[PDB]
Amino acid sequence: GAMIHAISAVNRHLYEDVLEQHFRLRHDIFVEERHWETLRRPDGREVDSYDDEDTVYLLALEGRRVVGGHRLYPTTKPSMMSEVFPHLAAVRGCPSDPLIWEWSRYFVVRDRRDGALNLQLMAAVQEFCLDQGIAQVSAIMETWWLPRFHEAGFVVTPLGLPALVENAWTMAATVDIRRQTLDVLHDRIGMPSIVQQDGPRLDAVARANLC
Ligand SMILES: CC(C)CCSCCNC(=O)CCNC(=O)[C@H](O)C(C)(C)COP(=O)(O)OP(=O)(O)OC[C@H]1O[C@@H](n2cnc3c(N)ncnc32)[C@H](O)[C@@H]1OP(=O)(O)O
Ligand SMILES: C[S@@+](CC[C@H](N)C(=O)[O-])C[C@H]1O[C@@H](n2cnc3c(N)ncnc32)[C@H](O)[C@@H]1O
């Protein structure tokens, strides 16, 4: 059936159509719906300084329609946490490691909310990272994400004090990538694999080491 596709520098030539579609959906969702006005752009594409040659996109596709997704960025480069929100990680420190990737821009289009897709997206980050040998992901998120992580069996390590960010309670944390977490999620989604990787093989950890 429908799969989550891992899109990076090595295979984006197969997904240029899909990538553009997702930038516009990100604008509809994060700018128009969430009202994150600092991300508004006149081209109607929601693109920031962490959308570059090293970004990995995990996009839920139905045919060529993007129905959900999220992205990963190496913490060996300047990151959203290190550059924008370092005060949120003042207790433990901002991650900087080839084996830790920054996780952001999680979305499900309205048509697919409150269904099977969400848990598939939760499984997808675990599956991709385990395959790549990535040990942890880091995230800045609103505190309503905590019960969602816990419900999916995600092992969460807070990096600092929660704080108001543009009027919303926000925190920085890592998530442990675990075979055990993934195994349970595979059972729950009723699929042995949720991540499709077309085109040339990506060596994410090697790329992050170069950075
Ligand atoms: C890498 C990550 C960490 C970066 C995040 S990046 C920021 C998170 N992303 C977004 O807010 C994008 C806009 N939203 C979406 O794409 C979807 O609403 C998401 C968050 C993916 C959730 O989709 P689904 O789980 O399929 O279903 P849903 O009915 O939309 O939500 C399920 C439950 O989740 C909760 N929820 C969703 N959005 C919320 C919000 N803005 N504030 C407080 N609570 C919120 C809520 O409890 C809801 O159930 P309800 O109470 O019955 O409505
Ligand atoms: C929870 S935080 C940031 C992380 C967000 N959950 C994500 O994964 O994309 C949301 C707040 O950070 C801001 N923000 C998101 N990406 C940003 C960037 N690249 N630069 C500056 N601010 C950003 C948004 O305007 C919003 O007020």
PDB file of C-alpha atoms and ligand atoms in Angstrom:
ATOM      1  CA  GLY A   1       0.000   0.000   0.000  1.00  0.00           C
ATOM      2  CA  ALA A   2       0.969   3.635   0.625  1.00  0.00           C
ATOM      3  CA  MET A   3       4.503   4.145   1.984  1.00  0.00           C
ATOM      4  CA  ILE A   4       6.742   6.816   3.535  1.00  0.00           C
ATOM      5  CA  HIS A   5       9.552   7.735   1.120  1.00  0.00           C
ATOM      6  CA  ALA A   6      13.055   8.686   2.262  1.00  0.00           C
ATOM      7  CA  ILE A   7      14.194  11.594   0.072  1.00  0.00           C
ATOM      8  CA  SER A   8      17.734  13.012   0.197  1.00  0.00           C
ATOM      9  CA  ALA A   9      20.469  14.514  -2.006  1.00  0.00           C
ATOM     10  CA  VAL A  10      21.258  11.084  -3.508  1.00  0.00           C
ATOM     11  CA  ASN A  11      17.726  10.390  -4.821  1.00  0.00           C
ATOM     12  CA  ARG A  12      15.894  13.743  -4.983  1.00  0.00           C
ATOM     13  CA  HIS A  13      16.143  13.682  -8.796  1.00  0.00           C
ATOM     14  CA  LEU A  14      13.311  11.121  -8.517  1.00  0.00           C
ATOM     15  CA  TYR A  15      11.201  13.392  -6.284  1.00  0.00           C
ATOM     16  CA  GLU A  16      11.560  17.032  -7.419  1.00  0.00           C
ATOM     17  CA  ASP A  17       7.783  17.206  -8.060  1.00  0.00           C
ATOM     18  CA  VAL A  18       6.966  15.779  -4.630  1.00  0.00           C
ATOM     19  CA  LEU A  19       9.478  18.016  -2.812  1.00  0.00           C
ATOM     20  CA  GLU A  20       7.965  21.218  -4.248  1.00  0.00           C
ATOM     21  CA  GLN A  21       4.481  19.989  -3.369  1.00  0.00           C
ATOM     22  CA  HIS A  22       5.549  19.442   0.274  1.00  0.00           C
ATOM     23  CA  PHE A  23       7.112  22.930   0.584  1.00  0.00           C
ATOM     24  CA  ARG A  24       3.756  24.433  -0.420  1.00  0.00           C
ATOM     25  CA  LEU A  25       1.836  22.124   1.948  1.00  0.00           C
ATOM     26  CA  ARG A  26       4.221  23.193   4.737  1.00  0.00           C
ATOM     27  CA  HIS A  27       3.218  26.789   3.978  1.00  0.00           C
ATOM     28  CA  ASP A  28      -0.512  25.926   4.095  1.00  0.00           C
ATOM     29  CA  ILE A  29      -0.090  24.047   7.362  1.00  0.00           C
ATOM     30  CA  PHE A  30       2.633  25.808   9.372  1.00  0.00           C
ATOM     31  CA  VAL A  31       1.957  29.360   8.175  1.00  0.00           C
ATOM     32  CA  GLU A  32      -1.784  29.444   7.370  1.00  0.00           C
ATOM     33  CA  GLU A  33      -2.993  26.877   9.936  1.00  0.00           C
ATOM     34  CA  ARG A  34      -0.500  27.098  12.834  1.00  0.00           C
ATOM     35  CA  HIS A  35       0.062  30.845  12.263  1.00  0.00           C
ATOM     36  CA  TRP A  36       3.847  30.550  12.556  1.00  0.00           C
ATOM     37  CA  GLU A  37       4.178  33.971  10.911  1.00  0.00           C
ATOM     38  CA  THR A  38       7.983  34.098  11.050  1.00  0.00           C
ATOM     39  CA  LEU A  39       7.970  31.371   8.358  1.00  0.00           C
ATOM     40  CA  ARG A  40       5.688  33.242   5.921  1.00  0.00           C
ATOM     41  CA  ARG A  41       7.219  33.659   2.455  1.00  0.00           C
ATOM     42  CA  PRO A  42       5.806  35.448  -0.620  1.00  0.00           C
ATOM     43  CA  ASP A  43       6.564  32.478  -2.917  1.00  0.00           C
ATOM     44  CA  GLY A  44       4.120  30.341  -0.876  1.00  0.00           C
ATOM     45  CA  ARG A  45       6.909  27.860  -0.165  1.00  0.00           C
ATOM     46  CA  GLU A  46       7.818  27.191   3.479  1.00  0.00           C
ATOM     47  CA  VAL A  47      11.602  26.788   3.282  1.00  0.00           C
ATOM     48  CA  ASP A  48      14.144  27.618   6.016  1.00  0.00           C
ATOM     49  CA  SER A  49      17.938  27.448   6.492  1.00  0.00           C
ATOM     50  CA  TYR A  50      17.647  23.731   7.424  1.00  0.00           C
ATOM     51  CA  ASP A  51      16.309  22.888   3.964  1.00  0.00           C
ATOM     52  CA  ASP A  52      19.606  22.307   2.140  1.00  0.00           C
ATOM     53  CA  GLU A  53      21.735  19.564   0.514  1.00  0.00           C
ATOM     54  CA  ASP A  54      21.966  17.619   3.810  1.00  0.00           C
ATOM     55  CA  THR A  55      18.269  17.521   4.773  1.00  0.00           C
ATOM     56  CA  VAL A  56      16.431  14.192   4.644  1.00  0.00           C
ATOM     57  CA  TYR A  57      12.683  14.219   4.022  1.00  0.00           C
ATOM     58  CA  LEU A  58      10.377  11.377   5.062  1.00  0.00           C
ATOM     59  CA  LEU A  59       7.222  11.999   3.080  1.00  0.00           C
ATOM     60  CA  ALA A  60       3.995   9.982   3.086  1.00  0.00           C
ATOM     61  CA  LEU A  61       2.914   9.438  -0.523  1.00  0.00           C
ATOM     62  CA  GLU A  62      -0.352   8.246  -2.038  1.00  0.00           C
ATOM     63  CA  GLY A  63       0.683   7.864  -5.648  1.00  0.00           C
ATOM     64  CA  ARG A  64       2.404  11.206  -6.087  1.00  0.00           C
ATOM     65  CA  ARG A  65       0.210  13.025  -3.542  1.00  0.00           C
ATOM     66  CA  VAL A  66       2.026  14.092  -0.344  1.00  0.00           C
ATOM     67  CA  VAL A  67      -0.315  13.301   2.579  1.00  0.00           C
ATOM     68  CA  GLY A  68       2.098  13.758   5.490  1.00  0.00           C
ATOM     69  CA  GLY A  69       5.746  13.912   6.476  1.00  0.00           C
ATOM     70  CA  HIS A  70       8.637  15.181   8.581  1.00  0.00           C
ATOM     71  CA  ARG A  71      12.326  15.984   8.070  1.00  0.00           C
ATOM     72  CA  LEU A  72      15.729  15.176   9.565  1.00  0.00           C
ATOM     73  CA  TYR A  73      18.835  17.391   9.673  1.00  0.00           C
ATOM     74  CA  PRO A  74      22.365  16.574  10.886  1.00  0.00           C
ATOM     75  CA  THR A  75      23.346  18.101  14.254  1.00  0.00           C
ATOM     76  CA  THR A  76      27.000  18.293  13.065  1.00  0.00           C
ATOM     77  CA  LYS A  77      25.865  21.385  11.125  1.00  0.00           C
ATOM     78  CA  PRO A  78      24.412  24.497  12.808  1.00  0.00           C
ATOM     79  CA  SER A  79      20.886  23.419  13.761  1.00  0.00           C
ATOM     80  CA  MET A  80      17.554  24.957  14.768  1.00  0.00           C
ATOM     81  CA  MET A  81      18.362  24.074  18.375  1.00  0.00           C
ATOM     82  CA  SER A  82      21.947  25.421  18.331  1.00  0.00           C
ATOM     83  CA  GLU A  83      21.087  28.591  16.380  1.00  0.00           C
ATOM     84  CA  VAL A  84      17.501  29.506  17.285  1.00  0.00           C
ATOM     85  CA  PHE A  85      16.605  27.758  20.558  1.00  0.00           C
ATOM     86  CA  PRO A  86      19.848  27.046  22.499  1.00  0.00           C
ATOM     87  CA  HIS A  87      18.292  28.358  25.739  1.00  0.00           C
ATOM     88  CA  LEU A  88      15.864  25.387  25.605  1.00  0.00           C
ATOM     89  CA  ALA A  89      18.801  22.977  25.934  1.00  0.00           C
ATOM     90  CA  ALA A  90      20.793  24.886  28.557  1.00  0.00           C
ATOM     91  CA  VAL A  91      20.655  22.059  31.129  1.00  0.00           C
ATOM     92  CA  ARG A  92      22.019  19.173  29.023  1.00  0.00           C
ATOM     93  CA  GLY A  93      23.441  21.059  26.002  1.00  0.00           C
ATOM     94  CA  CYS A  94      22.527  21.149  22.295  1.00  0.00           C
ATOM     95  CA  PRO A  95      23.257  17.863  20.475  1.00  0.00           C
ATOM     96  CA  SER A  96      26.189  17.791  18.036  1.00  0.00           C
ATOM     97  CA  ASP A  97      26.868  14.267  16.816  1.00  0.00           C
ATOM     98  CA  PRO A  98      26.782  12.300  13.524  1.00  0.00           C
ATOM     99  CA  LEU A  99      24.497   9.850  15.361  1.00  0.00           C
ATOM    100  CA  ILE A 100      21.957  12.510  16.425  1.00  0.00           C
ATOM    101  CA  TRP A 101      19.686  14.122  13.831  1.00  0.00           C
ATOM    102  CA  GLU A 102      17.284  17.025  14.326  1.00  0.00           C
ATOM    103  CA  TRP A 103      13.626  16.127  13.694  1.00  0.00           C
ATOM    104  CA  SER A 104      11.049  18.756  12.635  1.00  0.00           C
ATOM    105  CA  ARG A 105       8.056  19.842  10.514  1.00  0.00           C
ATOM    106  CA  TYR A 106       5.790  16.871  11.298  1.00  0.00           C
ATOM    107  CA  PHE A 107       2.460  17.147   9.462  1.00  0.00           C
ATOM    108  CA  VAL A 108      -0.577  15.184   8.287  1.00  0.00           C
ATOM    109  CA  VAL A 109      -2.910  16.805   5.725  1.00  0.00           C
ATOM    110  CA  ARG A 110      -6.452  17.362   7.071  1.00  0.00           C
ATOM    111  CA  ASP A 111      -7.913  14.546   4.911  1.00  0.00           C
ATOM    112  CA  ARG A 112      -5.721  11.964   6.669  1.00  0.00           C
ATOM    113  CA  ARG A 113      -5.823  13.147  10.300  1.00  0.00           C
ATOM    114  CA  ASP A 114      -7.148  10.917  13.113  1.00  0.00           C
ATOM    115  CA  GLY A 115      -6.454   7.797  11.023  1.00  0.00           C
ATOM    116  CA  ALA A 116      -3.719   5.245  10.344  1.00  0.00           C
ATOM    117  CA  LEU A 117      -1.164   7.697   8.910  1.00  0.00           C
ATOM    118  CA  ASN A 118      -0.029   9.288  12.193  1.00  0.00           C
ATOM    119  CA  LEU A 119       1.298   6.095  13.784  1.00  0.00           C
ATOM    120  CA  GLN A 120       2.941   5.189  10.461  1.00  0.00           C
ATOM    121  CA  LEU A 121       4.845   8.504  10.574  1.00  0.00           C
ATOM    122  CA  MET A 122       5.902   7.718  14.168  1.00  0.00           C
ATOM    123  CA  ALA A 123       7.161   4.321  12.980  1.00  0.00           C
ATOM    124  CA  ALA A 124       8.935   5.868   9.972  1.00  0.00           C
ATOM    125  CA  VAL A 125      11.441   7.977  11.962  1.00  0.00           C
ATOM    126  CA  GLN A 126      12.375   4.918  14.051  1.00  0.00           C
ATOM    127  CA  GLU A 127      12.693   2.650  10.978  1.00  0.00           C
ATOM    128  CA  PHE A 128      14.797   5.061   8.918  1.00  0.00           C
ATOM    129  CA  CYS A 129      17.114   5.912  11.826  1.00  0.00           C
ATOM    130  CA  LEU A 130      17.609   2.271  12.866  1.00  0.00           C
ATOM    131  CA  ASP A 131      18.451   1.393   9.241  1.00  0.00           C
ATOM    132  CA  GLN A 132      20.987   4.249   9.113  1.00  0.00           C
ATOM    133  CA  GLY A 133      22.486   3.520  12.537  1.00  0.00           C
ATOM    134  CA  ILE A 134      21.282   6.878  13.898  1.00  0.00           C
ATOM    135  CA  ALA A 135      21.063   6.560  17.717  1.00  0.00           C
ATOM    136  CA  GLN A 136      18.845   9.523  18.665  1.00  0.00           C
ATOM    137  CA  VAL A 137      16.784  12.303  17.177  1.00  0.00           C
ATOM    138  CA  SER A 138      16.458  15.758  18.729  1.00  0.00           C
ATOM    139  CA  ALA A 139      13.397  18.009  18.547  1.00  0.00           C
ATOM    140  CA  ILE A 140      11.964  21.322  19.658  1.00  0.00           C
ATOM    141  CA  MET A 141       8.269  20.833  20.294  1.00  0.00           C
ATOM    142  CA  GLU A 142       5.191  22.002  22.124  1.00  0.00           C
ATOM    143  CA  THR A 143       4.504  20.150  25.361  1.00  0.00           C
ATOM    144  CA  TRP A 144       1.334  18.474  23.981  1.00  0.00           C
ATOM    145  CA  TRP A 145       3.757  16.140  22.136  1.00  0.00           C
ATOM    146  CA  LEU A 146       4.800  14.386  25.382  1.00  0.00           C
ATOM    147  CA  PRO A 147       1.730  12.108  25.695  1.00  0.00           C
ATOM    148  CA  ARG A 148       1.933  11.420  21.920  1.00  0.00           C
ATOM    149  CA  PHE A 149       5.570  10.265  22.271  1.00  0.00           C
ATOM    150  CA  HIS A 150       4.687   8.178  25.332  1.00  0.00           C
ATOM    151  CA  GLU A 151       1.694   6.584  23.538  1.00  0.00           C
ATOM    152  CA  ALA A 152       4.025   5.476  20.720  1.00  0.00           C
ATOM    153  CA  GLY A 153       6.537   4.060  23.240  1.00  0.00           C
ATOM    154  CA  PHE A 154       9.161   6.734  22.444  1.00  0.00           C
ATOM    155  CA  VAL A 155      11.909   7.058  25.068  1.00  0.00           C
ATOM    156  CA  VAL A 156      12.248  10.807  25.697  1.00  0.00           C
ATOM    157  CA  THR A 157      15.108  12.730  27.362  1.00  0.00           C
ATOM    158  CA  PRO A 158      14.360  16.415  28.105  1.00  0.00           C
ATOM    159  CA  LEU A 159      17.357  18.692  27.441  1.00  0.00           C
ATOM    160  CA  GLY A 160      16.231  21.765  29.380  1.00  0.00           C
ATOM    161  CA  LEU A 161      13.459  23.726  31.032  1.00  0.00           C
ATOM    162  CA  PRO A 162      10.192  24.156  29.144  1.00  0.00           C
ATOM    163  CA  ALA A 163       9.596  27.768  28.111  1.00  0.00           C
ATOM    164  CA  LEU A 164       7.098  29.972  26.310  1.00  0.00           C
ATOM    165  CA  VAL A 165       8.008  30.347  22.635  1.00  0.00           C
ATOM    166  CA  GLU A 166       5.743  32.824  20.815  1.00  0.00           C
ATOM    167  CA  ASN A 167       2.992  32.266  23.406  1.00  0.00           C
ATOM    168  CA  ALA A 168       3.146  28.433  23.447  1.00  0.00           C
ATOM    169  CA  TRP A 169       4.798  26.106  25.977  1.00  0.00           C
ATOM    170  CA  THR A 170       7.761  24.540  24.214  1.00  0.00           C
ATOM    171  CA  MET A 171      10.678  22.263  25.133  1.00  0.00           C
ATOM    172  CA  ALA A 172      13.749  20.574  23.648  1.00  0.00           C
ATOM    173  CA  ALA A 173      14.333  16.826  23.935  1.00  0.00           C
ATOM    174  CA  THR A 174      16.001  13.804  22.410  1.00  0.00           C
ATOM    175  CA  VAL A 175      14.206  10.621  21.424  1.00  0.00           C
ATOM    176  CA  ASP A 176      16.045   7.296  21.691  1.00  0.00           C
ATOM    177  CA  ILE A 177      15.911   5.222  18.510  1.00  0.00           C
ATOM    178  CA  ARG A 178      15.075   1.663  19.618  1.00  0.00           C
ATOM    179  CA  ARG A 179      14.556  -1.640  17.804  1.00  0.00           C
ATOM    180  CA  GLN A 180      12.074  -2.535  20.592  1.00  0.00           C
ATOM    181  CA  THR A 181      10.057   0.671  20.011  1.00  0.00           C
ATOM    182  CA  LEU A 182       9.992  -0.044  16.263  1.00  0.00           C
ATOM    183  CA  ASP A 183       9.024  -3.730  16.690  1.00  0.00           C
ATOM    184  CA  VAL A 184       5.929  -2.784  18.728  1.00  0.00           C
ATOM    185  CA  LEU A 185       4.992  -0.065  16.202  1.00  0.00           C
ATOM    186  CA  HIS A 186       5.356  -2.501  13.263  1.00  0.00           C
ATOM    187  CA  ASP A 187       2.858  -4.769  15.053  1.00  0.00           C
ATOM    188  CA  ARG A 188       0.515  -1.833  15.705  1.00  0.00           C
ATOM    189  CA  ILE A 189       0.577  -0.498  12.119  1.00  0.00           C
ATOM    190  CA  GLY A 190       0.283  -4.090  10.828  1.00  0.00           C
ATOM    191  CA  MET A 191       3.219  -3.713   8.416  1.00  0.00           C
ATOM    192  CA  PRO A 192       6.787  -5.099   8.576  1.00  0.00           C
ATOM    193  CA  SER A 193       8.179  -2.023   6.760  1.00  0.00           C
ATOM    194  CA  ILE A 194       6.906   1.552   6.296  1.00  0.00           C
ATOM    195  CA  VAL A 195       9.940   3.315   4.738  1.00  0.00           C
ATOM    196  CA  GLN A 196      10.570   3.066   0.980  1.00  0.00           C
ATOM    197  CA  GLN A 197      14.053   4.025  -0.286  1.00  0.00           C
ATOM    198  CA  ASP A 198      14.168   4.410  -4.101  1.00  0.00           C
ATOM    199  CA  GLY A 199      17.277   5.251  -6.152  1.00  0.00           C
ATOM    200  CA  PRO A 200      20.892   5.231  -4.869  1.00  0.00           C
ATOM    201  CA  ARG A 201      21.691   4.203  -1.269  1.00  0.00           C
ATOM    202  CA  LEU A 202      22.002   6.988   1.319  1.00  0.00           C
ATOM    203  CA  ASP A 203      24.767   6.827   3.925  1.00  0.00           C
ATOM    204  CA  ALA A 204      23.416   9.467   6.327  1.00  0.00           C
ATOM    205  CA  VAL A 205      25.986   8.945   9.110  1.00  0.00           C
ATOM    206  CA  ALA A 206      28.901   9.278   6.643  1.00  0.00           C
ATOM    207  CA  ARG A 207      27.403  12.529   5.275  1.00  0.00           C
ATOM    208  CA  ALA A 208      27.002  13.935   8.825  1.00  0.00           C
ATOM    209  CA  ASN A 209      30.641  13.043   9.585  1.00  0.00           C
ATOM    210  CA  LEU A 210      31.758  15.075   6.535  1.00  0.00           C
ATOM    211  CA  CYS A 211      29.849  17.994   8.089  1.00  0.00           C
TER     212      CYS A 211
HETATM  213  C1  LIG B   1       9.130  16.315  15.186  1.00  0.00           C
HETATM  214  C2  LIG B   1       7.897  16.944  15.814  1.00  0.00           C
HETATM  215  C3  LIG B   1       7.951  16.805  17.330  1.00  0.00           C
HETATM  216  C4  LIG B   1       7.791  18.402  15.384  1.00  0.00           C
HETATM  217  C5  LIG B   1       6.357  18.899  15.530  1.00  0.00           C
HETATM  218  S1  LIG B   1       5.995  20.184  14.380  1.00  0.00           S
HETATM  219  C6  LIG B   1       4.469  20.914  14.885  1.00  0.00           C
HETATM  220  C7  LIG B   1       3.372  19.851  14.899  1.00  0.00           C
HETATM  221  N1  LIG B   1       2.673  19.960  13.621  1.00  0.00           N
HETATM  222  C8  LIG B   1       1.582  20.562  13.406  1.00  0.00           C
HETATM  223  O1  LIG B   1       0.976  21.158  14.289  1.00  0.00           O
HETATM  224  C9  LIG B   1       1.062  20.521  11.982  1.00  0.00           C
HETATM  225  C10 LIG B   1      -0.468  20.662  11.928  1.00  0.00           C
HETATM  226  N2  LIG B   1      -1.069  19.446  12.474  1.00  0.00           N
HETATM  227  C11 LIG B   1      -1.038  18.259  12.012  1.00  0.00           C
HETATM  228  O2  LIG B   1      -0.465  17.956  10.974  1.00  0.00           O
HETATM  229  C12 LIG B   1      -1.768  17.194  12.800  1.00  0.00           C
HETATM  230  O3  LIG B   1      -2.810  17.828  13.573  1.00  0.00           O
HETATM  231  C13 LIG B   1      -0.856  16.328  13.696  1.00  0.00           C
HETATM  232  C14 LIG B   1      -0.137  17.153  14.765  1.00  0.00           C
HETATM  233  C15 LIG B   1       0.188  15.584  12.868  1.00  0.00           C
HETATM  234  C16 LIG B   1      -1.708  15.278  14.420  1.00  0.00           C
HETATM  235  O4  LIG B   1      -2.486  14.516  13.491  1.00  0.00           O
HETATM  236  P1  LIG B   1      -3.294  13.193  13.926  1.00  0.00           P
HETATM  237  O5  LIG B   1      -2.573  12.533  15.070  1.00  0.00           O
HETATM  238  O6  LIG B   1      -3.556  12.378  12.680  1.00  0.00           O
HETATM  239  O7  LIG B   1      -4.743  13.691  14.411  1.00  0.00           O
HETATM  240  P2  LIG B   1      -5.277  15.100  14.972  1.00  0.00           P
HETATM  241  O8  LIG B   1      -6.736  14.858  15.262  1.00  0.00           O
HETATM  242  O9  LIG B   1      -4.885  16.247  14.072  1.00  0.00           O
HETATM  243  O10 LIG B   1      -4.547  15.278  16.393  1.00  0.00           O
HETATM  244  C17 LIG B   1      -4.603  14.225  17.352  1.00  0.00           C
HETATM  245  C18 LIG B   1      -4.443  14.802  18.746  1.00  0.00           C
HETATM  246  O11 LIG B   1      -3.195  15.491  18.869  1.00  0.00           O
HETATM  247  C19 LIG B   1      -3.343  16.641  19.696  1.00  0.00           C
HETATM  248  N3  LIG B   1      -3.038  17.875  18.935  1.00  0.00           N
HETATM  249  C20 LIG B   1      -2.905  17.988  17.605  1.00  0.00           C
HETATM  250  N4  LIG B   1      -2.628  19.276  17.306  1.00  0.00           N
HETATM  251  C21 LIG B   1      -2.598  19.970  18.464  1.00  0.00           C
HETATM  252  C22 LIG B   1      -2.366  21.301  18.788  1.00  0.00           C
HETATM  253  N5  LIG B   1      -2.100  22.217  17.829  1.00  0.00           N
HETATM  254  N6  LIG B   1      -2.402  21.680  20.084  1.00  0.00           N
HETATM  255  C23 LIG B   1      -2.662  20.799  21.063  1.00  0.00           C
HETATM  256  N7  LIG B   1      -2.883  19.510  20.777  1.00  0.00           N
HETATM  257  C24 LIG B   1      -2.858  19.079  19.486  1.00  0.00           C
HETATM  258  C25 LIG B   1      -4.792  16.674  20.139  1.00  0.00           C
HETATM  259  O12 LIG B   1      -4.866  16.063  21.429  1.00  0.00           O
HETATM  260  C26 LIG B   1      -5.500  15.838  19.094  1.00  0.00           C
HETATM  261  O13 LIG B   1      -6.681  15.209  19.576  1.00  0.00           O
HETATM  262  P3  LIG B   1      -8.014  16.039  19.969  1.00  0.00           P
HETATM  263  O14 LIG B   1      -7.718  16.581  21.351  1.00  0.00           O
HETATM  264  O15 LIG B   1      -9.079  14.966  19.949  1.00  0.00           O
HETATM  265  O16 LIG B   1      -8.188  17.110  18.916  1.00  0.00           O
HETATM  266  C1  LIG B   2       8.029  24.123  18.315  1.00  0.00           C
HETATM  267  S1  LIG B   2       8.876  25.358  17.581  1.00  0.00           S
HETATM  268  C2  LIG B   2      10.075  24.894  16.502  1.00  0.00           C
HETATM  269  C3  LIG B   2      10.083  23.438  16.046  1.00  0.00           C
HETATM  270  C4  LIG B   2       8.831  23.006  15.295  1.00  0.00           C
HETATM  271  N1  LIG B   2       8.046  22.168  16.183  1.00  0.00           N
HETATM  272  C5  LIG B   2       9.225  22.180  14.108  1.00  0.00           C
HETATM  273  O1  LIG B   2       9.524  20.987  14.302  1.00  0.00           O
HETATM  274  O2  LIG B   2       9.252  22.700  12.986  1.00  0.00           O
HETATM  275  C6  LIG B   2       7.770  26.311  16.767  1.00  0.00           C
HETATM  276  C7  LIG B   2       8.164  27.788  16.818  1.00  0.00           C
HETATM  277  O3  LIG B   2       9.478  27.972  16.283  1.00  0.00           O
HETATM  278  C8  LIG B   2       9.471  28.828  15.131  1.00  0.00           C
HETATM  279  N2  LIG B   2      10.375  28.285  14.078  1.00  0.00           N
HETATM  280  C9  LIG B   2      10.257  27.111  13.415  1.00  0.00           C
HETATM  281  N3  LIG B   2      11.276  26.944  12.525  1.00  0.00           N
HETATM  282  C10 LIG B   2      12.075  28.023  12.619  1.00  0.00           C
HETATM  283  C11 LIG B   2      13.323  28.500  11.972  1.00  0.00           C
HETATM  284  N4  LIG B   2      13.949  27.777  11.016  1.00  0.00           N
HETATM  285  N5  LIG B   2      13.824  29.698  12.369  1.00  0.00           N
HETATM  286  C12 LIG B   2      13.226  30.453  13.318  1.00  0.00           C
HETATM  287  N6  LIG B   2      12.089  30.076  13.942  1.00  0.00           N
HETATM  288  C13 LIG B   2      11.479  28.902  13.643  1.00  0.00           C
HETATM  289  C14 LIG B   2       8.016  28.923  14.690  1.00  0.00           C
HETATM  290  O4  LIG B   2       7.703  30.211  14.153  1.00  0.00           O
HETATM  291  C15 LIG B   2       7.245  28.657  15.973  1.00  0.00           C
HETATM  292  O5  LIG B   2       7.027  29.885  16.675  1.00  0.00           O
END
